[PDB]
């Protein structure tokens, strides 16, 4: 079951279905045309027409509208959230609140302006802890901005000014410092709008089983429309011809609406059964298509990584010692709100169990990450604790005038080739060491990736982060061939390439970066540890942090492909038997001697065809309980499994139509509605 | 007479299986493109002289070549029938046919349908029959066996880009496959009594004093292709009941063998070229069960016969007002089922005078699509379309990707097979419906009651299923009837043929996949049952009311 508020809003969306969009589903739209014609002839009877029976056609029209409403209800339950939503991107574009300047200077005349205020040629400052309004170039100053949308890495990047690093795309959170940005890119067609262009334009392709089922529906509908249409001139040779309203009832009763209801009953049962593996599935077509996947695209930071970057080891030089840089690192991560700093504290207790360095009792003069020097740390009265990246280290060495530690340089580029981001500390002259901040692998995903290799899924890791650490993480996780330093457009191109190759593609991620990848993915899984945009996009949201939920997703997809084949067996047999069950009712009216063809001795052809309408309204309802709690789930070979399926569900698809028509006509006869 | 039908069916089936195997191996050599023994050099000289040479062509070139040859033959036959006055060999100066009948015959003798609406003794001349109509039967049979050769080559070719050569294939078909068998059965027709001369119409003075005029013409030269290529339109108004046409029940047996010889030879050729005879025996068992059960019921209904004749003083109530006496009633029913199954319009007996059930079951095999022991080339690709139908019905029943003969099948093949399967029920329903709207077609009634509508449905189904058989007595000389049947025959056969080349081209470009877990085994009694259930139930789905409002109504009333 699903919550009442979401099913009520979804039923409002169902009632929103107009004929402008009703022709997406052909069998249900043909039922809709038949309903319109029988409602029109019913109100013509109310206004006065040639025949005399009106309530029978009124009941046909009412039950046909119930059938249409329930079919559209199940259809919206299956794929009302399949479309990728860009509400988070729209909100972060519309929050605006830019700080406009009329003179380029740190202070000057700045006011709050919306996003539409920006144009060709503008000056806007972003200070500290705000959002960049639009794409542009840096005029002056230095800023540490978090490249969240680009490269998917939470580690901050310094931009500065007067160099090659003056391009701020907008939508990226500034961490500290301040910046003045010239608006060179117009409102519209910016970086976020180029993202939202195919975040909104997802258009996931239809699964081959669904296309083949739709083609079978078209074929059977052409057959039944052909028969009911040629019934009219073929009865002109009889004494009395068939009526137009009962011909419309035959047209809306014969067509395989059971399989059309099944087309979404499978998805509804899929969203119901996905809660067993603790995954919020917004659309059941991806759950169905999970059994025919062949590749798995994956993002490093967030999905394979735990998130924040952890600390591996303190690497000192030969002239210093483990304690002699561990104390400096602990001082450098005292007043550090960063989870990396918390990891430094954890490793400090892991090595030395160091104490009595209180955050406020010790006079910790905190220097933040400087814009122009890129150095940060803690100063005490007799010791100046600072740390930073290697270029800032070399700048500080040049400012001091001392000899440079090239041994530290080869240590840090060795660990960078290993795949760690260096963080060098400055105390104890220039001969103190570095913290190896490297990416970290989650709880034993290598065995699950080997299981994926055995199953046949090709795992390709694409993240847009640094190539060296990306290759290191791929090697540590057992990933196959991979891509690195890729744009979101490159992820889109890879998704389109894997879709054009023919195989279904599954993409799992957490960040805003791969939102187009999740939008264009066939079976897309979001991550609960990620941002809101990834959860809004895609078809699946993982409730846990486990990246290898796709094993259970593929298992339930194969099981539900098997049960979908079983239900297709039952539905095809049901429609074939229903044709024979309600076909003699077209002959008793136009020919008296064919009532012996009626077999069951139905009370009247009108009662039989009204019972067919009731069976139409009831079978699509009963499919969902039949979709739930399947009988056959263990795999067999093709011929024996088809034999067992055909037996156990052809008996059902033969017995259910005859029994249903007979029971409903008996109920109608004892109710006296005829 | 109960066991006599069983012995007749058993004898016919055994002699068919005996005669099919060498022709099956030869036809399999024709798929394999290896030259027949003794014809290696002469065919090379002929191809060099004609200019066809060797040029591998794709499905589009094949399709436009076949339809260009068919359209050119159609234009040639239309002009030849129009200019009947100027042509030689006219012992009686017969008038040239009207434009409507000329168009009807021109589109009829092309595209294998070979429907007849005239009487050739008073309408058709010698030279049209001798030259135009015989070569049109030849070209129709060659085109059908070439299109099925292309489909078989598309199935057996892996990762290629061509199908063969159109005119090379047609030459190798009609110079060494149809012509020698035509000699060997035409000389037998002459031995048992037929006409292969050019004498004028001869006066006959009877003992009663009422003189008559004997029909005249080269009968056996048209017989040997009308039976072999399953065309079904003869010199005479009786397609196979005239004494000069079909003399003896022994020749009736030879005619039955010639009608079923080519399709089962194609099936054996397909089985031999697939590498496993299990597929060939599977299709032949699937057609043989329908053939046996449908010669049954028909035989029982015809030996039950007229209920009025028993009470009217006749000793035997056997249905005999539509048949002859040299051949009885059981062989009449057998030939009726054969000719309604094989898309051959040759009637041994007047189908209009049959019992209701024993006329509806041959009409049932008429309506279904001529797929059970079917046309000269039409029936095999009809069976291939329906087995592809059964393959993806099994695939969607099994929940996995459907492949046939190790080759994957996708959505383009899906749509094209659906169109090719459903094009003929659409035509046989809509054309018949249009005929019952118009008062002109309703003016062509012969039997009042549901039998007139049954006659109309039979005529439209014969048009759009490419058969040629008819409940006789229909006044099909009307321009409306002629044009409607002409359009039905044209769009029916060509809108079946074009998707066949679409399937062939889409299967050439693919490759034979290996064994898989989801691959359905394409042989066995289970697959026979699935295929027969598929074709019989789709035919039921689109033909229950049309049969119920006609012959079933006549039987119940």
């Amino acid at each position: 079951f699903e919550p009442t508020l979401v099913v009520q809003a979804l039923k409002e969306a169902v009632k929103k279905l107009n004929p402008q969009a009703q022709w997406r589903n052909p069998v249900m739209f043909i039922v809709w045309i038949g309903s319109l014609l029988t409602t029109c002839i019913s109100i013509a009877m109310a206004s006065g027409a040639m025949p005399g029976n009106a309530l029978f056609s009124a009941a046909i029209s009412g039950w046909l509208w119930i059938t249409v409403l329930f079919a559209n209800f199940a259809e919206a339950l299956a794929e009302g959230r399949s479309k990728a939503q860009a509400n988070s991107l729209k909100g972060v574009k519309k929050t605006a609140f830019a700080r406009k300047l009329r003179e380029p200077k740190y202070g000057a005349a700045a006011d709050k302006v919306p996003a539409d205020q920006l144009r060709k040629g503008d000056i806007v400052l972003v200070e500290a802890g705000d959002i960049i309004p639009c794409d542009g170039e840096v005029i002056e100053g230095g800023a540490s901005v978090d490249e969240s949308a680009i490269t998917g890495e939470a580690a901050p990047v310094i931009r500065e000014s007067g160099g090659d690093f003056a391009s701020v795309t907008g939508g990226t959170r500034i961490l500290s410092d301040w910046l003045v940005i010239e608006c060179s890119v117009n409102p519209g067609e910016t970086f976020l709008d180029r993202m939202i262009a195919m975040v909104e334009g997802a258009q996931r392709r239809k699964t081959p089983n669904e296309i083949a089922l739709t083609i079978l529906l078209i074929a059977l509908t052409i057959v039944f429309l052909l028969a009911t249409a040629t019934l009219w001139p073929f009865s002109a040779w009889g004494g009395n011809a068939v009526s137009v309203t009962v011909l419309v009832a035959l047209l809306v009763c014969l067509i395989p609406t059971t399989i059309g209801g099944l087309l979404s009953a499978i998805g509804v049962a899929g969203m119901s059964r996905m809660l067993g593996a603790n995954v919020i599935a917004t659309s059941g077509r991806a759950v169905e298509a999970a059994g025919d996947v062949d590749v798995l695209l994956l993002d490093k930071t967030g999905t394979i990584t735990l998130g924040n970057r952890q600390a591996s080891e303190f690497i000192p030089a030969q002239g210093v010692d483990e304690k002699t840089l561990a104390d400096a690192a602990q001082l450098a991560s005292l007043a550090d709100e960063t989870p990396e700093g918390r990891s430094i504290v954890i490793l400090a207790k892991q090595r030395f169990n160091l104490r009595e360095r209180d955050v406020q009792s010790l006079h910790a003069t905190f220097v933040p990450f400087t814009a122009q020097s890129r150095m940060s740390g803690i100063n005490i009265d007799n010791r100046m604790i600072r740390k930073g990246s290697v270029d800032a280290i070399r700048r500080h060495v040049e400012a001091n005038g001392g000899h440079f530690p090239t041994d530290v340089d080869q240590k840090v580029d060795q660990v960078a080739r290993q795949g760690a981001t260096p963080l060098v500390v400055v105390e104890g002259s220039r001969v103190l060491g570095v913290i190896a901040l490297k990416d970290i692998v989650k709880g034993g995903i290598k065995e699950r990736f080997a299981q994926l290799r055995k199953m046949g899924i090709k795992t390709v890791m694409i993240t847009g982060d640094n190539r060296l650490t990306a290759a290191a993480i791929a090697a540590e996780a057992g990933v196959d061939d991979f891509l690195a330093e890729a744009t979101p457009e490159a992820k889109l191109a890879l998704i389109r390439q894997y879709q054009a190759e023919g195989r279904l593609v599954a993409m799992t991620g957490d960040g805003t970066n791969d939102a187009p990848a999740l939008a264009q993915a066939d079976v897309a899984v979001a991550m609960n540890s990620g941002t809101q945009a990834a959860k809004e996009a895609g078809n699946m949201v993982d409730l846990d942090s486990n990246p290898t939920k796709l094993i259970e997703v593929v298992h339930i997809g194969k099981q539900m492909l098997m049960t979908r084949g079983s239900l297709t067996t039952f539905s095809i047999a049901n429609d074939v038997a229903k044709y024979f069950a309600i076909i003699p009712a077209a002959f008793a009216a136009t020919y008296p001697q064919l009532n012996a063809l009626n077999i069951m001795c139905l009370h009247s052809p009108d009662s039989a065809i009204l019972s067919a309408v009731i069976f139409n309204a009831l079978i699509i309802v009963f499919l969902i309980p039949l979709a739930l709690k399947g009988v056959s789930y263990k795999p067999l070979t093709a011929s024996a499994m088809l034999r067992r399926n055909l037996w156990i569900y052809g008996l059902g698809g033969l017995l259910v139509p005859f029994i249903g028509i007979k029971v409903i006509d008996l109920l109608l006869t004892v109710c006296g509605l005829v | 007479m109960a066991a006599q039908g069983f012995l007749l069916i058993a004898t016919f089936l055994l002699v068919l299986m005996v005669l099919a195997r060498p022709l099956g191996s030869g036809l399999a050599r024709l798929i394999n493109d290896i030259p027949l023994p003794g014809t290696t050099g002469v065919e090379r000289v002929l191809f060099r002289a004609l200019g066809v040479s060797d040029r591998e062509m794709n499905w589009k070139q094949y399709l436009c070549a076949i339809l260009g040859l068919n359209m050119l033959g159609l234009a040639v036959l239309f002009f030849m029938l129009l200019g009947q006055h100027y042509l030689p060999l006219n012992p009686q100066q017969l008038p040239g046919l009207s434009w409507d009948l000329a168009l009807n015959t021109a589109v009829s003798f092309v595209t294998n349908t070979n429907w007849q609406s005239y009487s050739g003794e008073t309408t058709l001349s010698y030279f049209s029959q001798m030259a135009g109509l015989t070569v049109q039967n030849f070209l129709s049979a060659a085109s059908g066996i070439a299109v099925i050769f292309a489909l078989i080559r598309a199935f057996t070719r892996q990762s290629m880009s061509t199908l063969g050569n159109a005119w090379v294939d047609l030459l190798r078909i009609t110079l060494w496959v149809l012509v020698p068998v035509a000699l060997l059965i035409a000389l037998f027709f002459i031995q048992q009594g037929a006409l292969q001369n050019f004498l004028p119409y001869q006066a006959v003075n009877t003992v009663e004093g009422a003189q008559q005029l004997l029909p005249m013409g080269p009968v056996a030269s048209q017989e040997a292709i009308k039976m072999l290529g399953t065309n079904g339109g003869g010199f005479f108004n009786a397609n196979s009941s005239h004494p000069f046409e079909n003399p003896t029940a022994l020749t009736n047996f030879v005619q039955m063998l010639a009608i079923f010889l080519i399709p089962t030879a194609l099936c054996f050729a397909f089985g031999e070229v697939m590498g496993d005879r299990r597929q060939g025996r599977m299709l032949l068992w699937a057609m043989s069960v329908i053939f046996v059960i449908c010669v049954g019921v028909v035989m029982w209904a015809e030996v039950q016969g007229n209920p009025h004749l028993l009470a009217l003083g006749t000793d035997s109530s056997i249905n005999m007002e539509g048949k002859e006496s040299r051949f009885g009633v059981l062989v009449s029913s057998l030939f009726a089922v054969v000719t309604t199954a094989a898309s051959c319009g040759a009637v041994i007996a007047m189908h209009d005078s049959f019992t209701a059930l024993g006329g509806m079951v041959p009409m049932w095999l008429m309506q279904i699509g001529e797929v059970v022991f079917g046309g000269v080339g039409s029936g095999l690709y009809g069976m291939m379309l329906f087995v592809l139908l059964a393959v993806f019905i099994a695939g969607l029943m099994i929940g996995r990707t459907p492949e046939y003969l190790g080759k994957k099948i996708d959505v383009r093949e899906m749509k094209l097979t659906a169109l090719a399967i459903l094009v003929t029920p659409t035509l046989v329903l809509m054309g018949a419906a249009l005929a019952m709207m118009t008062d002109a077609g309703r003016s062509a009634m012969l039997n009042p009651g549901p039998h007139g509508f049954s006659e109309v449905l039979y005529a439209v189904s014969s048009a759009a299923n490419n058969n040629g058989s008819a409940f006789a007595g229909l006044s099909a000389n009307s321009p409306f009837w002629n044009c409607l049947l002409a359009f039905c025959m044209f769009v029916g056969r060509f809108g079946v043929i074009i998707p066949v080349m679409a399937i062939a081209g889409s299967l050439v470009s693919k490759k034979s996949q290996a064994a898989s877990s989801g691959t359905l085994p394409t042989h066995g009694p289970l697959f026979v049952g699935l295929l027969i259930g598929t074709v019989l139930l789709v035919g039921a789905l689109t033909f229950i009311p049309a049969l119920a409002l006609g012959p079933v109504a006549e039987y119940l009333s």
Partner: peptide, 27 residues
Amino acid sequence: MSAGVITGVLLVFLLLGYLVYALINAE
């Protein structure tokens, strides 16, 4: 005179054309 017969024929023709359209293109 066809009071609704010709309208029914046109409706069947248009609906069959729409069905063939939906067969050709997977909606």
